[PDB]
């Protein structure tokens, strides 16, 4: 008989442990694995695939239309859309990125925001996208917007433009749930010159917008998502 | 590892930021393709986002309850919670489901942890000390009929004996007929015109039968069982879109009617911040 | 002078040419291949009809109009009646296959509109009834007709609400599945190569569909002034590397 | 040290440290180079 | 004194464990082993010995007669017997194979079904046995039957015919307790030409039928058999 | 047609033994080419020699 | 590691991995070859 002493914590059950436990049904024998395409190893692998952002959130019931950012022909100087960058809330929240970020407490890294244009091929347009780093207000006019991170996008044969929100930060991690100290800025978009439709054409054209994370990205300290809850256990 | 390299002014014919998303690719664009950057290192590995880590902590998967009381004159033990089942799931308690359903196919060893606590809601002189028995009476296995049937001999059938207030742990390999468990299944068990749909067809693995071994004392004792499940040795294939609407049933994808808009409406314009 | 843009796919006795492609997607970066022995279970030698089943079948055409919500086809169902592919299907106990899907929609440089073409492995549909109502067989086996998401709820059928992918997930996130867009201004076809994806090495072709192909208008069709307000969309699909096993009497399936 | 005979009874697995998003982010048939035109 | 911590599960009794326990009566001394013919090591060794199937189940109390499949002289085209292949139920259930399969939850593998003919030596017959893989109905006529796995048996000097039901399956394991998704097919038998008795002879002749498992076979996940139960403990 | 128009046609060859196809479904099950009208103005379909007998009569 | 002195006190035995059905499936005195006639 070897002398032992038990410490504080004996008998506790910590749902975040990784120890051994006996095998209820020994000498069993699993079924062999066959090959299946698509294996995922890290959630970091999947948040780099871009998905659509319901940017046009202004509706009243969920609709395919809140994915469409409208553009008006012949407007000059004006603003196309605006949003803050609380990736865990608001427009971002239902996107795959938003949806995964919510399983973690802290995030750090660059984001990739792209816009794909869908107007007739014989039209043309020049837009400016601007990222405003924390510390200033959402820009109120392009002059204000153009003094921060921006890209003049020229609509052409190449249909999409990929803007990166480079990680601009004092503190090396931000909270995924919106927090002030930790806030990330604003994203706005304005006409640089203006949309022009060809003859025989009319109305609004739309941009689709996507979001995905750069390879830069870090997420840490897992927790429970506000995105799902329940009141009684389900049954069959 | 560098998180960003140093990059300076650019005036090229080589534009990495113009792409065609119609192709289905997400081109790997970085901050340094469109602003001037400085070197910085990652200092991070992505350890805690590994799927083994993501699915590897214990989650509550089931709460049931049984009572110790005089069975004298009870015509239906099962019905008096003199014992009680649990049609093995993992999709009843939605918190771990969304997690799991982020994947199509998924393979993982298992580690079950059962906590049992007792309650004595009405006048008792004391708290008795009960031993719970937990058993696996699967497909072919004689189901318990009374709380003290021959079934409970369970001599070929695994079964646990632990004390109420304590905890019963153990683990299990992948006992799923195929190479992975289907998180989803767009099929039927056969080409029948009325047979059921979903995965409720596949997820066949009998139920768990709990009972108190003790005979009855003078008062009644409620024992409530909580089953926790931790995946170990995880393997997951084919990522899918996360669950947006609420769940209604074990094993079907169905959402409730007149549900509410899941996308938050802006308080303001598209232009609003 | 090769462009990403022009392409030719010859499979069996049938060829497709596109002069306005946008590359092609190969699901999960894997190309269809036959079933290796190391992965095999059934001891039966399989049958590989080759060129008589691995050719291009063009399903009947759809009509995109400003009110369209989107269409959904299931595989191998959509092909249950095409030539010898279909016969083999009803006659063997088990079968396995990959596909090349080519979705076509041409317009002019004055039109606008953008379709999402996506392949979803194991697309289990939801009942519009809620609760645990099931979706009857016939409803998930529309055949070449596919399911029309702008048709009415029917009884025993699935829900046809587009912002929810017919299953409780948001349209916006379908992009995690192999997919390609058809943006009239860019593109005129979409091509996806689908490797066989299952948790078993070979399965039944009638009780289980292993992918749904979905074509969904996202930016509404907008025709030039006084143009007819609609465009046809055509889907052509070719089984590839098909194998059938466990031949016998010939399945009888509901309806 | 494993104290038990069966593999299911061992603790959690250890980090894939695999990580390759290209099956998801770039499943295109003809390779796309960043910087070269998307559609030629 | 070495510091320890006890984990969840301490003190539990799992009837499926394999740990050490003290020896109640030490320094004992067992009796030597002598040699005994017949040692069994695996249940897989014994399920390969064939045993008779009470195929003729149509009686009302157990009788030697339900082991006998009758044959009629001069019938043409017709069907001799039919059964599904739920090895854990129905005809199979009392056979040694059926009886062991019931101690396990899953089975996979090939089955060997043989028929031994017992009619007068001067008679003759040609039968067809057909295996119908899952997915079709039990065949309704030989035409239907002959399109699946089959053997034309010619009754001769060699008295028995061994048909194999080769493992035809998507899923690599089936349930021993009958389940749909997991179902294995049907087995039928028909006259190929017809039984012919010699002169001076009359009546029915019978076939005996056996079942055993091929070396192919796998059984896993032990459990309790529905084949035995009790209401009070027995005594001497 | 004008350069700013577009069209997709299917040409089908039906080998001896069946009737002239009556609808595209019927037509598409034999030798066929989906032609996409583009910059490249012509499409060349080949009627590959499908035959039991190695020569046919010109009349 | 055995902690106890007696052999009865050790854990379960380890798989025969013996397996030879012929004493049960083919106890015939003159050897039968599959494919050759049963009765000559
Ligand atoms: C109490 O002793 C036991 C002895 C053996 C057992 O095995 C349980 C196997 C069930 C695994 C369920 C995993 N799953 C189910 C559906 N999806 C995932 C159990 Cl649960 C308990």
Count of folded domains of chain B: 1
**Biggest interface, residues from each chain:** A-B, 98 and 97 residues
**SSE arrangement of chain B, N to C:** EEEHEEHEEEEEEE
CATH architecture of chain C: Sandwich
Let me know the number of strands of chain B: 12
At the fold tier of CATH, the topology name of chain C is Jelly Rolls
So, CATH architecture of chain B? Sandwich
Structural class of chain C: mainly beta
Strand-residue fraction of chain C?
25-35%
Please tell me how large the radius of gyration of chain B is.
26 Å
- What is the CATH class of chain C? Mainly Beta
Q: Could you give the order of the helices and strands of chain C?
A: EEEEEEHEEEEEEE
Number of beta-strand segments of chain C: 13
Largest β sheet strand count, sense and barrel closure of chain C: 6 strands, mixed
PDB class: virus
Keywords: coat protein, Icosahedral virus, Virus
Entry title: structure determination of antiviral compound SCH 38057 complexed with human rhinovirus 14
Chains A, E, F: human rhinovirus 14 coat protein (subunit VP3)
Could you walk me through the main structural features you see in this protein, from its secondary elements to its overall organization?
Chain F: This is Capsid protein VP3. Chain F: It is found in: Virion; Host cytoplasm. Chain F: Forms an icosahedral capsid of pseudo T=3 symmetry with capsid proteins VP2 and VP3. The capsid is 300 Angstroms in diameter, composed of 60 copies of each capsid protein and enclosing the viral positive strand RNA genome. The PDB classes it as virus. The structure is cut from a larger assembly and holds three copies of chain A, one copy of chain B (273 residues), one copy of chain C (255 residues) and two copies of chain D (40 residues). Chain A has 236 residues and is mainly beta. Helices cover 6% and strands 30% of the residues of chain A. Chain A has helices spanning 43-46, 96-101, 142-146, and strands at 4-6, 39-40, 51-52, 68-71, 79-84, 104-108, 111-117, 126-132, 149-154, 160-165, 174-175, 186-191, 205-213, 218-222. In chain A, strands 3, 4, 7, 10 and 13 form a five-stranded antiparallel beta sheet that branches. A four-stranded antiparallel beta sheet of chain A has the order 5-12-8-9. Chain A has a three-stranded antiparallel beta sheet with strand order 11-6-14, with no helix packed on it. Chain B contains two helices and twelve strands, in the order E-E-E-H-E-E-H-E-E-E-E-E-E-E. Chain C has 255 residues and is mainly beta. Chain C has one domain: Jelly Rolls. Helices cover 4% and strands 35% of the residues of chain C. Chain C is built from one helix and 13 strands, in the order ββββββαβββββββ. Chain C has one helix at residues 83-91; strands at 7-11, 14-18, 25-26, 57-58, 62-65, 71-75, 92-104, 112-121, 147-148, 179-183, 189-194, 211-222, 230-247. In chain C, the strands form three sheets. In chain C, strands 3, 4, 5, 7, 11 and 13 form a six-stranded mixed beta sheet that branches. Classes of the chains: A mainly beta (236), B mainly beta (273), C mainly beta (255), D little secondary structure (40). Chains in contact: A-B, A-C, A-D, A-E, B-C, B-D, B-E, C-D, C-E, C-F, E-G. The interface between A and B is large, with 98 and 97 residues. The structure holds 1-[6-(2-chloro-4-methyxyphenoxy)-hexyl]-imidazole. Residues 88, 90, 110, 112, 134, 136, 158, 160, 172, 175, 181, 203, 205, 208 of chain B line the site of 1-[6-(2-chloro-4-methyxyphenoxy)-hexyl]-imidazole.
């Amino acid at each position: 008989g070897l002398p032992t002493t038990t410490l504080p914590g004996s008998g506790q059950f910590l749902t975040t442990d990784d120890r051994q436990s006996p095998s209820a049904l020994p000498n069993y024998e699993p079924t062999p694995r066959i090959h299946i395409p698509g294996k995922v190893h890290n959630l970091l692998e999947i948040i780099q695939v871009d998905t659509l952002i319901p940017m046009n959130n202004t509706h009243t019931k969920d609709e395919v239309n809140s994915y469409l950012i409208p553009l008006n022909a012949n407007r000059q100087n004006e603003q196309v859309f605006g949003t803050n960058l609380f990736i865990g809330d608001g427009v971002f929240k239902t996107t795959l990125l938003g949806e995964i970020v919510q399983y973690y407490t802290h995030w750090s890294g660059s984001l990739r925001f792209s816009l794909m244009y869908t107007g007739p091929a014989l039209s043309s347009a020049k837009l400016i996208l601007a990222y405003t780093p924390p510390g200033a207000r959402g820009p109120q006019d392009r002059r204000e917007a153009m003094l921060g991170t921006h890209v003049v996008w020229d609509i052409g044969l190449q249909s999409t433009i990929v803007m990166t929100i480079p990680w601009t930060s004092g503190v090396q991690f931000r909270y995924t749930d919106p927090d002030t100290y930790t806030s990330a800025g604003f994203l706005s978009c304005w006409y640089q010159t203006s949309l022009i439709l060809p003859p025989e054409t009319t109305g609004q054209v739309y941009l689709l917008s996507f979001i995905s994370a750069c390879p830069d990205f870090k997420l840490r300290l897992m927790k429970d998502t506000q995105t799902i809850s329940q009141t009684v256990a389900l049954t069959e | 590892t560098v998180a960003s390299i140093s990059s300076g002014p650019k005036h090229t014919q080589k534009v990495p930021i113009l792409t065609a998303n119609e192709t289905g690719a997400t081109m790997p664009v970085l901050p340094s393709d469109s602003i001037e950057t400085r070197t910085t290192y990652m200092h991070f590995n992505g350890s805690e986002t590994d799927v083994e880590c993501f699915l590897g902590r214990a989650a509550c998967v089931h709460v049931t309850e049984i009572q110790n009381k005089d069975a004298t004159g009870i015509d239906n033990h099962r019905e008096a919670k003199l014992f009680n089942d649990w049609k093995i799931n993992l999709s009843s308690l939605v918190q771990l489901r969304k997690k799991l359903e982020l994947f199509t196919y998924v393979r993982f060893d298992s580690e079950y942890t059962i906590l049992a606590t007792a309650s004595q809601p009405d006048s008792a002189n004391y708290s008795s000390n009960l031993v719970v028995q937990a058993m696996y009476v699967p497909p072919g296995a004689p189901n318990p009929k009374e709380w003290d049937d021959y079934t409970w001999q369970s001599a070929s059938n695994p079964s646990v004996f632990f004390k109420v207030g304590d905890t019963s742990r153990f683990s299990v390999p992948y006992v799923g007929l195929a190479s992975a468990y289907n998180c989803f299944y767009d099929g039927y068990s056969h080409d029948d015109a009325e047979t059921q749909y979903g995965i409720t067809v596949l997820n066949h693995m009998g139920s768990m039968a709990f009972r108190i071994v003790n005979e009855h004392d003078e008062h009644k004792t409620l024992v409530k069982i909580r089953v926790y499940h931790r995946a170990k040795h995880v393997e997951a294939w084919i990522p899918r879109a996360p669950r947006a609407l609420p769940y209604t049933s074990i094993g079907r994808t169905n959402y409730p009617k007149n549900t509410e808009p899941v996308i938050k409406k802006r308080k303001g314009d598209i232009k609003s911040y | 002078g090769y462009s990403d843009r022009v392409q030719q796919i010859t499979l069996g006795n049938s060829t497709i040419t596109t002069q306005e492609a946008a590359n092609a997607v190969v699901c999960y970066a894997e190309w269809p291949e036959y079933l290796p022995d190391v992965d095999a279970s059934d001891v039966n030698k399989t049958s590989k009809p080759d060129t008589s089943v691995c050719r291009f079948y063009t399903l009947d055409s759809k009509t995109w109009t400003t009110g369209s919500k989107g269409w959904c086809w299931k595989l191998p169902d959509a092909l249950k009646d095409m030539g010898v592919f279909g016969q083999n299907m009803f006659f063997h106990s088990l079968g396995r296959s990959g596909y090349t899907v080519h979705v076509q929609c041409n317009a002019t440089k004055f039109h606008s509109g953008c379709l999402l073409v996506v392949v979803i492995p194991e697309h289990q549909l939801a009942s519009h009834e809620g609760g645990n109502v099931s979706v009857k067989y016939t409803f998930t086996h529309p055949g070449e007709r596919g399911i029309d998401l702008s048709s009415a709820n029917e009884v025993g059928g699935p829900v046809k609400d587009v912002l929810y992918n017919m299953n409780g997930t948001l349209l916006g996130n379908l992009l995690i599945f192999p997919h390609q867009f058809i943006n009239l201004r860019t593109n005129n076809t979409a091509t996806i190569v689908i490797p066989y994806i299952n948790s078993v090495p070979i399965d039944s072709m009638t009780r289980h569909n292993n992918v749904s192909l979905m074509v969904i208008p996202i930016a509404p069709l907008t025709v030039p002034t006084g143009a007819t307000p609609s465009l046809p969309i055509t889907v052509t699909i070719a089984p590839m590397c098909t194998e059938f096993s466990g031949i016998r009497s010939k399945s009888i399936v509901p309806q | 040290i494993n104290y038990y005979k069966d593999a299911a009874s061992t603790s959690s697995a250890g980090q894939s440290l695999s990580m390759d998003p290209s099956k998801f982010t770039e499943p295109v048939k003809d390779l796309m180079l960043k910087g070269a035109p998307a559609l030629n």
